[PDB]
A paper describes a structure:
A recent case of systemic amyloidosis involves the highly unstable D76N mutation of beta-2 microglobulin (β2m). The D76N mutant is strongly amyloidogenic and, in contrast to the wt protein, aggregates efficiently and abundantly without seeding and under native conditions. Indeed, the 76 position is located in a solvent exposed loop between β-strands E and F. A detailed analysis of the interaction energies of the ensembles reveals that D76 is at the center of a network of stabilizing electrostatic interactions that are lost in the D76N mutant.
To better compare these data with crystallographic data, the crystal structures of wt and D76N were determined from diffraction data collected at room temperature (RT) rather than at 100 K. The RT structures are highly comparable in terms of conformation and B factors with structures from frozen crystals. Although D76N β2m rapidly converts into non-soluble oligomers and amyloid fibrils in solution, the intrinsic dynamics of both wt and mutant forms of the protein can be studied in the crystals using solid-state NMR (ssNMR). While this is in principle not surprising, as loops may feature significant mobility also in the presence of crystal packing, it is intriguing to observe that the fitted order parameters are consistently lower in D76N than in wt β2m, reflecting an increase in flexibility upon mutation. However, in D76N, major changes are clearly observed in the EF-loop, as well as for the residues at the end of the A-strand. In the case of residues 75–76 in D76N, 15N R1ρ rates were so large for low spin-lock fields that the signals disappeared within the shortest relaxation delay, indicating extensive exchange contribution for these two residues. A second mode affects the EF-loop and remote residues at the end of the A-strand, and produces a clear experimental signature only for D76N β2m. Mutation of D76 to N weakens a number of interactions with charged residues. In particular a salt-bridge with K41 is lost and the interaction with the R97 side chain that mediates an interaction between the C- and the N-termini of the protein disappears. Overall this explains the higher loss of β structure at the N- and C-termini in D76N minor substate, thus linking the lower fold stability with the increased aggregation propensity in such minor substate. Enhanced aggregation propensity in D76N appears to be correlated with the existence of a high-energy state characterized by a loss of structure in the protective edge β-strands.
Numbering used by the authors: 0 to 99
Amino acid sequence: MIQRTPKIQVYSRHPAENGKSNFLNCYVSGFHPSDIEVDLLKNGERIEKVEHSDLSFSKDWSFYLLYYTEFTPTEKNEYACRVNHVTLSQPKIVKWDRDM
């Protein structure tokens, strides 16, 4: 058996087709087992309108999850990713660094 802690990256992107849109992205990588809970948070509250989630695996071993949604960042709001996994003793919260 193997278990691996997820690596978590939070960042923003503009689709080149559009430019108008800004997307908040949580990239959760290299984890095992695949059981996982992932949420985007605004000011601490769960964002239930998350339009996109892509899951893949490399070898039979490690899993990769891209979780993202459109958003409009202001200075007044905090955005974060929350991840719970069997390898974590407590949910991990990773805050969005505003120029990433």
